[PDB]
Amino acid sequence: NLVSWACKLCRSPEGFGPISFYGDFTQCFIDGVILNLSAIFMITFGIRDLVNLCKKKHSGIKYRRNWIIVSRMALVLLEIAFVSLASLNISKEEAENFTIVSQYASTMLSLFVALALHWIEYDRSVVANTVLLFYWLFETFGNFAKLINILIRHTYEGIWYSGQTGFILTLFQVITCASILLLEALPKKPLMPHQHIHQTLTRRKPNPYDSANIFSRITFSWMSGLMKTGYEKYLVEADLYKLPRNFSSEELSQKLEKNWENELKQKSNPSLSWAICRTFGSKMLLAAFFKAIHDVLAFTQPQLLRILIKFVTDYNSERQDDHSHPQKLPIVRGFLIAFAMFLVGFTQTSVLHQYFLNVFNTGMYIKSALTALIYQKSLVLSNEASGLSSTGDIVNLMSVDVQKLQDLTQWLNLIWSGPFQIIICLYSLYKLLGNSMWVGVIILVIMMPLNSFLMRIQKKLQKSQMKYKDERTRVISEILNNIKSLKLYAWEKPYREKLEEVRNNKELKNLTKLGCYMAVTSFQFNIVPFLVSCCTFAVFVYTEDRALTTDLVFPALTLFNLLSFPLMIIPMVLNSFIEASVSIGRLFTFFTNEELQPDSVQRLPKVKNIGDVAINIGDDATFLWQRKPEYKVALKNINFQAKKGNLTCIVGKVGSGKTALLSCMLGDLFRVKGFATVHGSVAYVSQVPWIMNGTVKENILFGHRYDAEFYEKTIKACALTIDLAILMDGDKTLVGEKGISLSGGQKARLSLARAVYARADTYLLDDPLAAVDEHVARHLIEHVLGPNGLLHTKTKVLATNKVSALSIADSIALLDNGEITQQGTYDEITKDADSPLWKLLNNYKLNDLDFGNSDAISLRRASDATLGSIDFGDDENIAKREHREQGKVKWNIYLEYAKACNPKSVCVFILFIVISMFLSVMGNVWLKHWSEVNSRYGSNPNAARYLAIYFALGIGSALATLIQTIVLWVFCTIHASKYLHNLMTNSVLRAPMTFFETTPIGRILNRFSNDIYKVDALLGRTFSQFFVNAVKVTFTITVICATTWQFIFIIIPLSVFYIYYQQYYLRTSRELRRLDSITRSPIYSHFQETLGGLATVRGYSQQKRFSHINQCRIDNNMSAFYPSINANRWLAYRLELIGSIIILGAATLSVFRLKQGTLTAGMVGLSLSYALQITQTLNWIVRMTVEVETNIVSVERIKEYADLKSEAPLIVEGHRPPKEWPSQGDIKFNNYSTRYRPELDLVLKHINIHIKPNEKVGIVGRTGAGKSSLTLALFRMIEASEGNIVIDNIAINEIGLYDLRHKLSIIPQDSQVFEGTVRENIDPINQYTDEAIWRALELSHLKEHVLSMSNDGLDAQLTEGGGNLSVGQRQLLCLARAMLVPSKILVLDQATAAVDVETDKVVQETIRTAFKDRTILTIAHRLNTIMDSDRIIVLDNGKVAEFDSPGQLLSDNKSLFYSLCMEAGLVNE
């Protein structure tokens, strides 16, 4: 019945059906659906906006009425005129059709609504309105479809289907609608001059996303200005924009806090997950809608491919039949199918990136909200509940688990969109191939567990690699820290060999195994998609009686990809869900954790009167440390009053209640009974000082206003004047994890100075004086604490056992057993000696997750994501910024890396990439030929032959891929890694000592561990994924151009645009990733800092300030992360647009070949099968260029360290001295003078001295006299500026450094021990016997201790830095090392040693017994040790002032040595 009503409405022969015989929409469908629904859309939503805009004030923003609005209104009036005039053109027969008249009427009404809406929108909107933009888009599209329809019917039937005047008016309506669309979208409104006078913007500019109309938001055009800016210069945090309106972490945290509190109150089973879903879940629903549309559009494409191959076949059949009534097929159908393919691609892109936009926004919301809520929770979290877990664990709760809940949102929609795509695909393939599809399904089902098994093995080998990398890093740190000892002892060779052993025979072995398993997975992912199709066709051809023709063949090839790649991602989704589940469990355990009692102590306004109670604990109060597992009473029946000005002291033993009575007044303790009141502001001084990372000045000010007068007075009172005079920048010196490490007393005085400067009304001093020196303690008691001091008007409570501090107290209470047993003034206790207080006092990395499934690029991306790996951060990227974006790529680095690899191996690897892709393409060409033969015969002749050849080509491609990956890993990457590490080691170990002094050890350890790992595990993979996809795109374009040579003229400008976008994305995304990485870290560091000082922050009540700082840092990280994400969308939209244009060009040129009569179905099948797959490869090439550009900086750094200028040669062939030398120990300096560095003055000046054989010499001088430089001059750690040295008649400048240093013994200034066995630390070369080592240990008095360490004896392990050995034991170990060396010369450095005397006398014993025959030079600091010597070198300002016997020197009263002994207090008379 009902359809007859539609057949009464429409009265045209083509009917109300959607697609006509010619392939375009019928005129009945255009009038009845497209233009009518567009008009109804306008009539509803435009009037909705017309209502919603007129409620807003007209003077919010003033725009001047220039040509823009006049043009819009005038052209809308013109459009109304044309619609009316065309409505007059309707003939008698045309008027019978309901659709035409209804369409014109509804369009007229919608045009009036749009005419009003333009005028209202111009004044009362800052962006071009979305309703108008979409309405004019649909109106242009509908009128253009009508114009195309009319042109087609005129061409094929010779009639203007609605009159010539109808045609020309439709043309003018197309033009006018397009012009109004562009005038709505592109122009930017002109502000009135009043607004610019009002403007005062000087901070970061507002975000352009808020000013972007819907076409700009879909295409992400708002990013282009930032991409251009970041391509012209290096980006800095001031160049970024503000966050959009709703991204502030305060607002999000408040929303989620409201929902979480409602969850806690409403339900007896609260859950954090449902609170998060209830808060932020709307955008995930919208994203789900978009993902569904994307899936449907993605599966539409093989249908269009099948229809176009069918059209080509039927067209060629009809033309051959004529060559050898129903309507002969029109060629317009092919062009319209091609344009349909283009439209499907474009819409798919535009929808997919709005899906990504929504999921990434939701992830950012979750991260900001949860980070803010964790921080806000930790401040109120009770002291003991905080004590339950380490600060590192809670910082990992913020750092890891919130990252996992962020990452979940990407994977979230795939739990339904996987099965959705799989069901659509299986239905489509069933409609194509029947029951043959099930073998293709079964192959993927079987291959999934094998793929998970391989992923398991790769996770195993990745963990093993991280273990071995940490081991090598430990060895490198050992070598670098003790580099001076290595150079002086000449031990660099055995330790280099040990390092090489560890590097080669464990790490590179594991890397070879990991490379082979990555080759196996590469072969798996290559062969399985082929096997699916091959076995499906095998089952089809042998069982179905249908001919395996082209339209069945190539759409099936397209569909098997869309089947495989969702199936092979679902396990990774489930894995992510499990990780997010445990993360939610940890977070929920943290948020439900117990908080402080909020009404423990009543804060009140301050007290003004002196002697009036400011702190009162009354009604016999009782306080608890804990309420779990039991009610542990801290303090029982306390009664305590403290009064303004009166210093009131708390006395007790350790754990007898000191900390509890102050933590009470902080409100940390839970209160059972009684009441407690604290008037006024509070200032807490912790028992263990807490220092913020920053300057001394900021540690003092602590958020208060800077007052120079009181600041200087405070520093004077707290006795910080001397220290802050000594410090590098004074009070601007950095302290904490960054900068200097202050002593305990210094930290205590800083905390006390902070408390003083705060000027709070009430002070709670938790024993600051313990760490302070007694005279400085007297200074403090006089200046700050005492009755005459600064705080004499403030209430002060001081828990301490110092009798001196207690003597000035105005009230004293002994607290023991958790009870105030006794309280009074000091006289009241002093009068009774037997009372208790009297006696007891006086007598006692990254993860760039951006995957969307149903592509092979996406299967690679997702499998890499689930393997995860690691890719560590950069450091001191700030220094190179001074160059400020010259932008030229250093291609010499690439060639030097290509030479690290064997270049012929690189050529072979590239060749096998080419051969793999060639065999794939030839397999598809053979499949085309086979399907054409099947089409000719109408059956499957000789199935075995064609199928065997296709199978052989597929396995050829698979084996070529396997050989490629095997060669890449085993031959190129590992060889380059070995060469680079060996080169860098041999360079660094031979560098002069000035390099190690200037360059921090942190940098060198970073180079050795992190950059070497990047060169090992990542760079080869990035190069592989670049080259494979580049060859794949080259061969795709080759195939398409082979089918239609005219395609060259399209791909040239498309490649120009491709290079343009790739350059912009490369530079800007590089810099935005840098900004994100640098801004991410301060959040967790700040959280660490806050967790170390919760009692202080709650003491000063700086909770709100610290929360604001954390929120600002979260927002400052999101401000850099947001463009970093949206740059990917900006790139990917344009590259998928380029792919869509490629599909359009290929299809249209194919249809143009069809017109000339030279086209078979197989050519279209092959060319469009290849064109459809290019979209994701095009962008994956660019993102691999970016990852290659990032990772090769490691090669640049390694080449930097390789190029260091070395020391003098270790062996000089023409000058090698004998084995006996130095046989007697004669030394001569002949006019020797030297400087530490070229940037410094001469340290030793014109030394000329002769040291006789076997004589014992002492060297003395004031600070800066250059004593230490002799230790470096003899061993040639510093070269000569003038003159030379001669040892046993051999000059020292001629000899090689190994021959020199190997035959001089030294007891160095800094005793250093290597992590290893005792025998290794005494004799790494294993040159000396165990008995000699035992005798050396015996004489150095270590033997018994070494035996007591373990049963291994000599082989007993020594930890890193000699942790299990005392400093004296280390010095005796160095003494043993010097003992075993048979050289006749000894240097005994003591320029800074002051540790112990008991080891000193043992050193003297070994000097006079073991070294009895050696020439001994003592670089002496302890002057008292010297007087046994023969001759003394008195250095003064670098020159040898005196060289004479101690007796002769002390004979002269005016001699410098006499003055030294006098000032030292050794020789007064």
Side-chain angles (χ1 to χ4, degrees), residues 1377-1394:
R1377 293 176 188 163
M1379 272 184 64
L1380 291 179
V1381 179
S1383 56
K1384 209 75 168 185
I1385 296 169
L1386 174 60
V1387 176
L1388 171 50
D1389 198 327
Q1390 304 183 343
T1392 58

mmCIF file with all atom_site columns, all heavy atoms in Angstrom, residues 1377-1394:
data_model
loop_
_atom_site.group_PDB
_atom_site.id
_atom_site.type_symbol
_atom_site.label_atom_id
_atom_site.label_alt_id
_atom_site.label_comp_id
_atom_site.label_asym_id
_atom_site.label_entity_id
_atom_site.label_seq_id
_atom_site.pdbx_PDB_ins_code
_atom_site.Cartn_x
_atom_site.Cartn_y
_atom_site.Cartn_z
_atom_site.occupancy
_atom_site.B_iso_or_equiv
_atom_site.pdbx_formal_charge
_atom_site.auth_seq_id
_atom_site.auth_comp_id
_atom_site.auth_asym_id
_atom_site.auth_atom_id
_atom_site.pdbx_PDB_model_num
ATOM 1   N N   . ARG A 1 1377 ? 98.092  -2.172 47.066 1.00 0.00 ? 1377 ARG A N   1
ATOM 2   C CA  . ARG A 1 1377 ? 98.281  -2.002 45.625 1.00 0.00 ? 1377 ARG A CA  1
ATOM 3   C C   . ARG A 1 1377 ? 99.645  -1.399 45.315 1.00 0.00 ? 1377 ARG A C   1
ATOM 4   O O   . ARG A 1 1377 ? 100.381 -1.898 44.457 1.00 0.00 ? 1377 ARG A O   1
ATOM 5   C CB  . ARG A 1 1377 ? 97.186  -1.107 45.041 1.00 0.00 ? 1377 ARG A CB  1
ATOM 6   C CG  . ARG A 1 1377 ? 95.780  -1.669 45.040 1.00 0.00 ? 1377 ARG A CG  1
ATOM 7   C CD  . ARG A 1 1377 ? 94.824  -0.601 44.529 1.00 0.00 ? 1377 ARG A CD  1
ATOM 8   N NE  . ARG A 1 1377 ? 93.421  -0.971 44.658 1.00 0.00 ? 1377 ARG A NE  1
ATOM 9   C CZ  . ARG A 1 1377 ? 92.418  -0.108 44.587 1.00 0.00 ? 1377 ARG A CZ  1
ATOM 10  N NH1 . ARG A 1 1377 ? 92.630  1.184  44.406 1.00 0.00 ? 1377 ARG A NH1 1
ATOM 11  N NH2 . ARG A 1 1377 ? 91.171  -0.553 44.703 1.00 0.00 ? 1377 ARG A NH2 1
ATOM 12  N N   . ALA A 1 1378 ? 99.981  -0.301 45.997 1.00 0.00 ? 1378 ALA A N   1
ATOM 13  C CA  . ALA A 1 1378 ? 101.293 0.315  45.825 1.00 0.00 ? 1378 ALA A CA  1
ATOM 14  C C   . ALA A 1 1378 ? 102.416 -0.626 46.247 1.00 0.00 ? 1378 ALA A C   1
ATOM 15  O O   . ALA A 1 1378 ? 103.508 -0.599 45.666 1.00 0.00 ? 1378 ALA A O   1
ATOM 16  C CB  . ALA A 1 1378 ? 101.368 1.618  46.614 1.00 0.00 ? 1378 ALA A CB  1
ATOM 17  N N   . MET A 1 1379 ? 102.176 -1.441 47.278 1.00 0.00 ? 1379 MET A N   1
ATOM 18  C CA  . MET A 1 1379 ? 103.190 -2.373 47.764 1.00 0.00 ? 1379 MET A CA  1
ATOM 19  C C   . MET A 1 1379 ? 103.591 -3.377 46.694 1.00 0.00 ? 1379 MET A C   1
ATOM 20  O O   . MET A 1 1379 ? 104.784 -3.648 46.503 1.00 0.00 ? 1379 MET A O   1
ATOM 21  C CB  . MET A 1 1379 ? 102.683 -3.109 49.004 1.00 0.00 ? 1379 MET A CB  1
ATOM 22  C CG  . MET A 1 1379 ? 102.947 -2.408 50.317 1.00 0.00 ? 1379 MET A CG  1
ATOM 23  S SD  . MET A 1 1379 ? 102.425 -3.427 51.702 1.00 0.00 ? 1379 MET A SD  1
ATOM 24  C CE  . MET A 1 1379 ? 103.541 -4.808 51.497 1.00 0.00 ? 1379 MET A CE  1
ATOM 25  N N   . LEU A 1 1380 ? 102.609 -3.964 46.001 1.00 0.00 ? 1380 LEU A N   1
ATOM 26  C CA  . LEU A 1 1380 ? 102.947 -5.043 45.072 1.00 0.00 ? 1380 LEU A CA  1
ATOM 27  C C   . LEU A 1 1380 ? 103.768 -4.562 43.881 1.00 0.00 ? 1380 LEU A C   1
ATOM 28  O O   . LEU A 1 1380 ? 104.545 -5.344 43.321 1.00 0.00 ? 1380 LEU A O   1
ATOM 29  C CB  . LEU A 1 1380 ? 101.697 -5.764 44.578 1.00 0.00 ? 1380 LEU A CB  1
ATOM 30  C CG  . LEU A 1 1380 ? 100.966 -6.597 45.624 1.00 0.00 ? 1380 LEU A CG  1
ATOM 31  C CD1 . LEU A 1 1380 ? 99.756  -7.224 44.989 1.00 0.00 ? 1380 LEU A CD1 1
ATOM 32  C CD2 . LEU A 1 1380 ? 101.884 -7.657 46.203 1.00 0.00 ? 1380 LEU A CD2 1
ATOM 33  N N   . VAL A 1 1381 ? 103.606 -3.311 43.467 1.00 0.00 ? 1381 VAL A N   1
ATOM 34  C CA  . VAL A 1 1381 ? 104.355 -2.805 42.309 1.00 0.00 ? 1381 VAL A CA  1
ATOM 35  C C   . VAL A 1 1381 ? 105.838 -2.728 42.661 1.00 0.00 ? 1381 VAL A C   1
ATOM 36  O O   . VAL A 1 1381 ? 106.199 -2.101 43.672 1.00 0.00 ? 1381 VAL A O   1
ATOM 37  C CB  . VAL A 1 1381 ? 103.819 -1.438 41.883 1.00 0.00 ? 1381 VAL A CB  1
ATOM 38  C CG1 . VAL A 1 1381 ? 104.606 -0.904 40.700 1.00 0.00 ? 1381 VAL A CG1 1
ATOM 39  C CG2 . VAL A 1 1381 ? 102.341 -1.532 41.540 1.00 0.00 ? 1381 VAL A CG2 1
ATOM 40  N N   . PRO A 1 1382 ? 106.726 -3.337 41.874 1.00 0.00 ? 1382 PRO A N   1
ATOM 41  C CA  . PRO A 1 1382 ? 108.143 -3.411 42.246 1.00 0.00 ? 1382 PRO A CA  1
ATOM 42  C C   . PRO A 1 1382 ? 108.960 -2.168 41.925 1.00 0.00 ? 1382 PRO A C   1
ATOM 43  O O   . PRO A 1 1382 ? 110.187 -2.221 42.045 1.00 0.00 ? 1382 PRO A O   1
ATOM 44  C CB  . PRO A 1 1382 ? 108.635 -4.607 41.419 1.00 0.00 ? 1382 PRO A CB  1
ATOM 45  C CG  . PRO A 1 1382 ? 107.807 -4.548 40.190 1.00 0.00 ? 1382 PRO A CG  1
ATOM 46  C CD  . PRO A 1 1382 ? 106.441 -4.092 40.641 1.00 0.00 ? 1382 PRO A CD  1
ATOM 47  N N   . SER A 1 1383 ? 108.328 -1.073 41.502 1.00 0.00 ? 1383 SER A N   1
ATOM 48  C CA  . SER A 1 1383 ? 109.064 0.113  41.083 1.00 0.00 ? 1383 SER A CA  1
ATOM 49  C C   . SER A 1 1383 ? 109.826 0.726  42.252 1.00 0.00 ? 1383 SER A C   1
ATOM 50  O O   . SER A 1 1383 ? 109.347 0.744  43.389 1.00 0.00 ? 1383 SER A O   1
ATOM 51  C CB  . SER A 1 1383 ? 108.108 1.144  40.489 1.00 0.00 ? 1383 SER A CB  1
ATOM 52  O OG  . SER A 1 1383 ? 107.083 1.467  41.410 1.00 0.00 ? 1383 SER A OG  1
ATOM 53  N N   . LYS A 1 1384 ? 111.024 1.235  41.962 1.00 0.00 ? 1384 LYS A N   1
ATOM 54  C CA  . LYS A 1 1384 ? 111.876 1.823  42.988 1.00 0.00 ? 1384 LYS A CA  1
ATOM 55  C C   . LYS A 1 1384 ? 111.383 3.181  43.468 1.00 0.00 ? 1384 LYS A C   1
ATOM 56  O O   . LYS A 1 1384 ? 111.910 3.694  44.460 1.00 0.00 ? 1384 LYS A O   1
ATOM 57  C CB  . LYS A 1 1384 ? 113.304 1.958  42.455 1.00 0.00 ? 1384 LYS A CB  1
ATOM 58  C CG  . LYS A 1 1384 ? 114.391 1.885  43.515 1.00 0.00 ? 1384 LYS A CG  1
ATOM 59  C CD  . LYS A 1 1384 ? 114.601 0.458  43.987 1.00 0.00 ? 1384 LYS A CD  1
ATOM 60  C CE  . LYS A 1 1384 ? 115.865 0.333  44.820 1.00 0.00 ? 1384 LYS A CE  1
ATOM 61  N NZ  . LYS A 1 1384 ? 116.140 -1.084 45.180 1.00 0.00 ? 1384 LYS A NZ  1
ATOM 62  N N   . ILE A 1 1385 ? 110.404 3.779  42.796 1.00 0.00 ? 1385 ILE A N   1
ATOM 63  C CA  . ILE A 1 1385 ? 109.917 5.113  43.122 1.00 0.00 ? 1385 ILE A CA  1
ATOM 64  C C   . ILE A 1 1385 ? 108.519 5.002  43.710 1.00 0.00 ? 1385 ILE A C   1
ATOM 65  O O   . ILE A 1 1385 ? 107.713 4.175  43.270 1.00 0.00 ? 1385 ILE A O   1
ATOM 66  C CB  . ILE A 1 1385 ? 109.934 6.011  41.871 1.00 0.00 ? 1385 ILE A CB  1
ATOM 67  C CG1 . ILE A 1 1385 ? 111.370 6.194  41.411 1.00 0.00 ? 1385 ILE A CG1 1
ATOM 68  C CG2 . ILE A 1 1385 ? 109.315 7.372  42.136 1.00 0.00 ? 1385 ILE A CG2 1
ATOM 69  C CD1 . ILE A 1 1385 ? 111.481 6.828  40.085 1.00 0.00 ? 1385 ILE A CD1 1
ATOM 70  N N   . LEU A 1 1386 ? 108.236 5.834  44.708 1.00 0.00 ? 1386 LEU A N   1
ATOM 71  C CA  . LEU A 1 1386 ? 106.917 5.905  45.312 1.00 0.00 ? 1386 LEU A CA  1
ATOM 72  C C   . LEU A 1 1386 ? 106.518 7.365  45.456 1.00 0.00 ? 1386 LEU A C   1
ATOM 73  O O   . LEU A 1 1386 ? 107.352 8.216  45.775 1.00 0.00 ? 1386 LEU A O   1
ATOM 74  C CB  . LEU A 1 1386 ? 106.900 5.206  46.674 1.00 0.00 ? 1386 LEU A CB  1
ATOM 75  C CG  . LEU A 1 1386 ? 105.635 5.296  47.527 1.00 0.00 ? 1386 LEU A CG  1
ATOM 76  C CD1 . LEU A 1 1386 ? 104.454 4.708  46.786 1.00 0.00 ? 1386 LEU A CD1 1
ATOM 77  C CD2 . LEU A 1 1386 ? 105.844 4.579  48.841 1.00 0.00 ? 1386 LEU A CD2 1
ATOM 78  N N   . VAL A 1 1387 ? 105.246 7.649  45.199 1.00 0.00 ? 1387 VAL A N   1
ATOM 79  C CA  . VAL A 1 1387 ? 104.633 8.933  45.515 1.00 0.00 ? 1387 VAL A CA  1
ATOM 80  C C   . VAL A 1 1387 ? 103.538 8.673  46.535 1.00 0.00 ? 1387 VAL A C   1
ATOM 81  O O   . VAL A 1 1387 ? 102.674 7.817  46.317 1.00 0.00 ? 1387 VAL A O   1
ATOM 82  C CB  . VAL A 1 1387 ? 104.061 9.615  44.260 1.00 0.00 ? 1387 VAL A CB  1
ATOM 83  C CG1 . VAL A 1 1387 ? 103.344 10.900 44.634 1.00 0.00 ? 1387 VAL A CG1 1
ATOM 84  C CG2 . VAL A 1 1387 ? 105.164 9.878  43.252 1.00 0.00 ? 1387 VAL A CG2 1
ATOM 85  N N   . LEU A 1 1388 ? 103.571 9.402  47.644 1.00 0.00 ? 1388 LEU A N   1
ATOM 86  C CA  . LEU A 1 1388 ? 102.612 9.211  48.728 1.00 0.00 ? 1388 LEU A CA  1
ATOM 87  C C   . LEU A 1 1388 ? 101.805 10.498 48.875 1.00 0.00 ? 1388 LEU A C   1
ATOM 88  O O   . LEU A 1 1388 ? 102.260 11.459 49.503 1.00 0.00 ? 1388 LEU A O   1
ATOM 89  C CB  . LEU A 1 1388 ? 103.331 8.833  50.022 1.00 0.00 ? 1388 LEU A CB  1
ATOM 90  C CG  . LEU A 1 1388 ? 102.558 8.794  51.342 1.00 0.00 ? 1388 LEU A CG  1
ATOM 91  C CD1 . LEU A 1 1388 ? 101.279 7.986  51.214 1.00 0.00 ? 1388 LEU A CD1 1
ATOM 92  C CD2 . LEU A 1 1388 ? 103.437 8.234  52.444 1.00 0.00 ? 1388 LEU A CD2 1
ATOM 93  N N   . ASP A 1 1389 ? 100.617 10.520 48.281 1.00 0.00 ? 1389 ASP A N   1
ATOM 94  C CA  . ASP A 1 1389 ? 99.787  11.714 48.257 1.00 0.00 ? 1389 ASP A CA  1
ATOM 95  C C   . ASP A 1 1389 ? 98.915  11.741 49.507 1.00 0.00 ? 1389 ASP A C   1
ATOM 96  O O   . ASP A 1 1389 ? 98.235  10.759 49.819 1.00 0.00 ? 1389 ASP A O   1
ATOM 97  C CB  . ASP A 1 1389 ? 98.923  11.739 46.995 1.00 0.00 ? 1389 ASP A CB  1
ATOM 98  C CG  . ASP A 1 1389 ? 98.372  13.123 46.679 1.00 0.00 ? 1389 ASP A CG  1
ATOM 99  O OD1 . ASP A 1 1389 ? 98.081  13.897 47.615 1.00 0.00 ? 1389 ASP A OD1 1
ATOM 100 O OD2 . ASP A 1 1389 ? 98.224  13.437 45.480 1.00 0.00 ? 1389 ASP A OD2 1
ATOM 101 N N   . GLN A 1 1390 ? 98.943  12.871 50.223 1.00 0.00 ? 1390 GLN A N   1
ATOM 102 C CA  . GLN A 1 1390 ? 98.106  13.063 51.403 1.00 0.00 ? 1390 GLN A CA  1
ATOM 103 C C   . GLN A 1 1390 ? 97.555  14.483 51.486 1.00 0.00 ? 1390 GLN A C   1
ATOM 104 O O   . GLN A 1 1390 ? 97.215  14.933 52.586 1.00 0.00 ? 1390 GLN A O   1
ATOM 105 C CB  . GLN A 1 1390 ? 98.870  12.778 52.705 1.00 0.00 ? 1390 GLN A CB  1
ATOM 106 C CG  . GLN A 1 1390 ? 99.507  11.407 52.825 1.00 0.00 ? 1390 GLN A CG  1
ATOM 107 C CD  . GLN A 1 1390 ? 100.172 11.204 54.170 1.00 0.00 ? 1390 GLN A CD  1
ATOM 108 O OE1 . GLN A 1 1390 ? 100.430 12.163 54.898 1.00 0.00 ? 1390 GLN A OE1 1
ATOM 109 N NE2 . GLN A 1 1390 ? 100.453 9.952  54.509 1.00 0.00 ? 1390 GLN A NE2 1
ATOM 110 N N   . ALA A 1 1391 ? 97.455  15.188 50.354 1.00 0.00 ? 1391 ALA A N   1
ATOM 111 C CA  . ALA A 1 1391 ? 97.137  16.616 50.338 1.00 0.00 ? 1391 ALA A CA  1
ATOM 112 C C   . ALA A 1 1391 ? 95.820  16.975 51.021 1.00 0.00 ? 1391 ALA A C   1
ATOM 113 O O   . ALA A 1 1391 ? 95.652  18.128 51.430 1.00 0.00 ? 1391 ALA A O   1
ATOM 114 C CB  . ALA A 1 1391 ? 97.115  17.123 48.896 1.00 0.00 ? 1391 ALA A CB  1
ATOM 115 N N   . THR A 1 1392 ? 94.883  16.029 51.164 1.00 0.00 ? 1392 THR A N   1
ATOM 116 C CA  . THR A 1 1392 ? 93.621  16.334 51.832 1.00 0.00 ? 1392 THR A CA  1
ATOM 117 C C   . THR A 1 1392 ? 93.194  15.267 52.835 1.00 0.00 ? 1392 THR A C   1
ATOM 118 O O   . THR A 1 1392 ? 92.067  15.338 53.341 1.00 0.00 ? 1392 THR A O   1
ATOM 119 C CB  . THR A 1 1392 ? 92.478  16.533 50.815 1.00 0.00 ? 1392 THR A CB  1
ATOM 120 O OG1 . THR A 1 1392 ? 92.337  15.356 50.008 1.00 0.00 ? 1392 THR A OG1 1
ATOM 121 C CG2 . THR A 1 1392 ? 92.713  17.752 49.923 1.00 0.00 ? 1392 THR A CG2 1
ATOM 122 N N   . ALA A 1 1393 ? 94.043  14.291 53.145 1.00 0.00 ? 1393 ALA A N   1
ATOM 123 C CA  . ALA A 1 1393 ? 93.638  13.192 54.010 1.00 0.00 ? 1393 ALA A CA  1
ATOM 124 C C   . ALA A 1 1393 ? 93.680  13.628 55.470 1.00 0.00 ? 1393 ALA A C   1
ATOM 125 O O   . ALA A 1 1393 ? 94.699  14.139 55.946 1.00 0.00 ? 1393 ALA A O   1
ATOM 126 C CB  . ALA A 1 1393 ? 94.542  11.979 53.790 1.00 0.00 ? 1393 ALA A CB  1
ATOM 127 N N   . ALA A 1 1394 ? 92.564  13.429 56.180 1.00 0.00 ? 1394 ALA A N   1
ATOM 128 C CA  . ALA A 1 1394 ? 92.484  13.800 57.589 1.00 0.00 ? 1394 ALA A CA  1
ATOM 129 C C   . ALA A 1 1394 ? 91.633  12.831 58.406 1.00 0.00 ? 1394 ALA A C   1
ATOM 130 O O   . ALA A 1 1394 ? 91.145  13.207 59.479 1.00 0.00 ? 1394 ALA A O   1
ATOM 131 C CB  . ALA A 1 1394 ? 91.931  15.222 57.743 1.00 0.00 ? 1394 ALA A CB  1
#
